[PDB]
Amino acid sequence: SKPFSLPILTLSELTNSRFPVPIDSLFTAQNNQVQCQNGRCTLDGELQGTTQLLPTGICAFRGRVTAQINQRDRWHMQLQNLNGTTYDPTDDVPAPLGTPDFKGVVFGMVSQRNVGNDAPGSTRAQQAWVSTYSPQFVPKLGSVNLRISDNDDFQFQPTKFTPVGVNDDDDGHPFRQWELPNYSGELTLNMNLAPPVAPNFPGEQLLFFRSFVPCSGGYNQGIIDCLIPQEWIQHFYQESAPSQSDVALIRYVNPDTGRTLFEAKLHRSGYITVAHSGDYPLVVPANGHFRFDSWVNQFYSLAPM
Amino acid sequence: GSKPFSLPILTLSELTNSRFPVPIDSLFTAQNNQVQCQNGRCTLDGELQGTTQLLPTGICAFRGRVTAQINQRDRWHMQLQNLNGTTYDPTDDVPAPLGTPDFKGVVFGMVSQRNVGNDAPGSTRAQQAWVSTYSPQFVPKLGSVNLRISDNDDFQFQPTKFTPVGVNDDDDGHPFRQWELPNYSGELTLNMNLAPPVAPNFPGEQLLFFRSFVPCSGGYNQGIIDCLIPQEWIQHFYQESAPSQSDVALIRYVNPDTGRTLFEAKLHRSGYITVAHSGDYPLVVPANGHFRFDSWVNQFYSLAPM
Ligand SMILES: C[C@@H]1O[C@@H](O[C@@H]2[C@@H](O)[C@@H](O)O[C@H](CO)[C@H]2O[C@@H]2O[C@H](CO)[C@H](O)[C@H](O)[C@H]2O)[C@@H](O)[C@H](O)[C@@H]1O
Ligand SMILES: C[C@@H]1O[C@@H](O[C@@H]2[C@@H](O)[C@@H](O)O[C@H](CO)[C@H]2O[C@@H]2O[C@H](CO)[C@H](O)[C@H](O)[C@H]2O)[C@@H](O)[C@H](O)[C@@H]1O
Ligand SMILES: [Mg+2]
Ligand SMILES: [Mg+2]
Numbered sequence: 001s002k003p004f005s006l007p008i009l010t011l012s013e014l015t016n017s018r019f020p021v022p023i024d025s026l027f028t029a030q031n032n033q034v035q036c037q038n039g040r041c042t043l044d045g046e047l048q049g050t051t052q053l054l055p056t057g058i059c060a061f062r063g064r065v066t067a068q069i070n071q072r073d074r075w076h077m078q079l080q081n082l083n084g085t086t087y088d089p090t091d092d093v094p095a096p097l098g099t100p101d102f103k104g105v106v107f108g109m110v111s112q113r114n115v116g117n118d119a120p121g122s123t124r125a126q127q128a129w130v131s132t133y134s135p136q137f138v139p140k141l142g143s144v145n146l147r148i149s150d151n152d153d154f155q156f157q158p159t160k161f162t163p164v165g166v167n168d169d170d171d172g173h174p175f176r177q178w179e180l181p182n183y184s185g186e187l188t189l190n191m192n193l194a195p196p197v198a199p200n201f202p203g204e205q206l207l208f209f210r211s212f213v214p215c216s217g218g219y220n221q222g223i224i225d226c227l228i229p230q231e232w233i234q235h236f237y238q239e240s241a242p243s244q245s246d247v248a249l250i251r252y253v254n255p256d257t258g259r260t261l262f263e264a265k266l267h268r269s270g271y272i273t274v275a276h277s278g279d280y281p282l283v284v285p286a287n288g289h290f291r292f293d294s295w296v297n298q299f300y301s302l303a304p305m
Numbered sequence: 306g307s308k309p310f311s312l313p314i315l316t317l318s319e320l321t322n323s324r325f326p327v328p329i330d331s332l333f334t335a336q337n338n339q340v341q342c343q344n345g346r347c348t349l350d351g352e353l354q355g356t357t358q359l360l361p362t363g364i365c366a367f368r369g370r371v372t373a374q375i376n377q378r379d380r381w382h383m384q385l386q387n388l389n390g391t392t393y394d395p396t397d398d399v400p401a402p403l404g405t406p407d408f409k410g411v412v413f414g415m416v417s418q419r420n421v422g423n424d425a426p427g428s429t430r431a432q433q434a435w436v437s438t439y440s441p442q443f444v445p446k447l448g449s450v451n452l453r454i455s456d457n458d459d460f461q462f463q464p465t466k467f468t469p470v471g472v473n474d475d476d477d478g479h480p481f482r483q484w485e486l487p488n489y490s491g492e493l494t495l496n497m498n499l500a501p502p503v504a505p506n507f508p509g510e511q512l513l514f515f516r517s518f519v520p521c522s523g524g525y526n527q528g529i530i531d532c533l534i535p536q537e538w539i540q541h542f543y544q545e546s547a548p549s550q551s552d553v554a555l556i557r558y559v560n561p562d563t564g565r566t567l568f569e570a571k572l573h574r575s576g577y578i579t580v581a582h583s584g585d586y587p588l589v590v591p592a593n594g595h596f597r598f599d600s601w602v603n604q605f606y607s608l609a610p611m
Binding site: 007008009012013015020021022053054055056057082083084107108109111113121122123124125126127160162164165212214215216217218219220221222231234235238 | 313314315318319321326327328359360361362363388389390413414415417419427428429430431432433466468470471518520521522523524525526527528537540544
């Protein structure tokens with residue numbers, strides 16, 4: 001059977017699977033619900049949730065603007081899949097792949113390029129925001145509404161949203177990275193979700209790949225934590241190596257010295273635990289990276305951090 | 306005992322342009338006319354060249370600190386760091402910090418800041434910005450570029466990131482020219498440490514590009530950015546580092562649904578593709594199609610006409 005492996009990449013050579021920026025650091029969290037939908041992939045290469053392969057697709061939208069309403073979330077964007085194919089709301093997914101998986105405001109830019117009868121080929125771009133609290137944030141149903149900076153220079157044309165960062169809303173709705181949006185809006189229940197993840201062995205905590213993403217005002221730290229980085233997902237999708245057990249023991253190595261700094265459990269469904277108690281930002285050498293060691297079971301006892 | 310060379314298995318819509326952070330839209334072969342892009346450059350055995358780095362989010366991005374303001378259109382002086390935040394060394398054997406744009410034009414996107422040190426550390430701001438690679442202050446090799454921004458009154462001398470969104474022509478006779486390299490050290494200085502120019506070296510052959518139509522911020526520009534190999538291939542070759550057994554790999558474009566080979570192409574050691582065709586031609590091929598490595602050939606191999 002095909003041997004399992006990780007790509008060999010340092011933290012600064014990794015992309016966050018939940019927001020399109022590099023990983024900054026590793027962090028282990030005290031146990032308190034973690035159920036992100038981007039950055040979800042099994043070790044044998046099955047994408048889950050809203051996970052797709054392109055880093056530039058994460059928290060992006062593609063579609064057409066078709067209407068406007070007299071509300072702050074003004075511009076109605078009918079979604080396509082990121083690859084431009086028609087979105088099917090009956091698909092067994094929580095929302096179009098790449099849809100943001102947190103409550104907050106995503107800021108970035110919208111761009112348009114006209115087709116058809118009105119000035120075909122004409123383009124425009126400007127700052128925009130997508131609130132995932134909005135009652136018009138209904139990506140599962142096939143649309144989201146945009147806030148934009150200049151309502152007078154925007155048309156009913158093919159549109160792309162390119163994310164840049166996140167924030168709390170200015171009306172006080174907070175950025176909550178672990179709270180899922182309502183993908184079909186008010187009074188609906190999310191479906192086809194990747195399951196929640198949590199440690200299942202005493203003394204263990206989740207380990208995250210952490211980024212501090214851009215914010216657009218105020219003091220928010222911009223923390224987005226992912227379970228496994230995008231390049232690992234891309235690798236597992238390519239390799240599709242059979243999982244020999246429920247846990248891949250992995251070692252964080254300093255390649256300059258050859259030493260193992262600590263060990264961790266990489267679970268079959270695509271998340272990591274370590275043996276530690278308390279919130280702890282790791283501060284480890286810049287050339288460090290994980291390597292696969294061996295297959296173990298759920299009850300393997302890790303060396304403490 | 307050579308490690309077998311391979312490509313990742315990815316359809317066009319599962320590929321990222323290595324010269325701008327967007328997906329590939331189509332394949333295009335061009336009539337012969339100089340092609341010397343610096344992003345998206347990697348040898349088949351995994352050696353990154355030019356200004357190529359590994360992350361799609363790094364392509365046409367900048368990171369550093371704004372340190373000065375000048376009274377000109379390109380107003381805000383951004384002292385660059387490497388994209389990973391480490392100190393940039395202008396004496397390194399690269400053309401410019403990795404990720405620097407490799408074309409003449411304007412890149413538009415957003416700048417964001419997050420303060421450090423004593424002055425309101427943790428405070429943030431973000432707004433639209435433009436970087437003109439025609440600017441005499443576009444001197445990334447020397448360690449800085451100047452930014453145009455939307456709101457000059459809300460911008461500080463603090464850590465800054467530029468996130469690209471699209472490209473455009475610049476104003477009054479400075480067009481977006483994807484095959485014209487900027488002067489990385491500014492006027493009157495020669496670019497150095499460049500990835501080499503690429504061209505077909507066999508009669509009847511043309512380059513094949515992975516083409517994207519990127520966003521533009523006004524006007525009618527098509528936003529065409531062509532790359533030699535997509536970012537995921539670069540990432541793959543960097544991981545694999547398979548020895549190249551000749552200067553030319555034969556690759557076939559296959560429809561996995563039918564198992565049929567649609568056409569063949571040469572994938573050259575320095576990381577670019579040629580096909581046997583005459584004339585500008587946008588390919589129209591099945592959505593599930595993808596290249597697979599067939600075998601190592603050589604310069605004398607005559608491709609079947611595309
Ligand atoms: C911390 C600041 O955040 C951003 O500015 C704030 C706006 O985003 C908005 O929320 O309103 C508040 C209050 O006016 C803004 O903060 C003030 O910003 C000014 C500068 O315009 C001063 O810095 C004040 O001290 C803030 O209270 C952002 O644009 C700004 O640059 C700051 O990072
Ligand atoms: C094609 C248009 O491109 C953008 O607007 C143009 C500006 O970017 C700039 O180049 O000046 C020209 C001419 O004034 C602008 O075109 C006019 O834009 C207005 C709307 O603001 C009308 O569309 C006119 O018909 C254009 O000539 C862009 O913002 C705009 O939406 C168009 O795509
Ligand atoms: Mg490994
Ligand atoms: Mg292959």
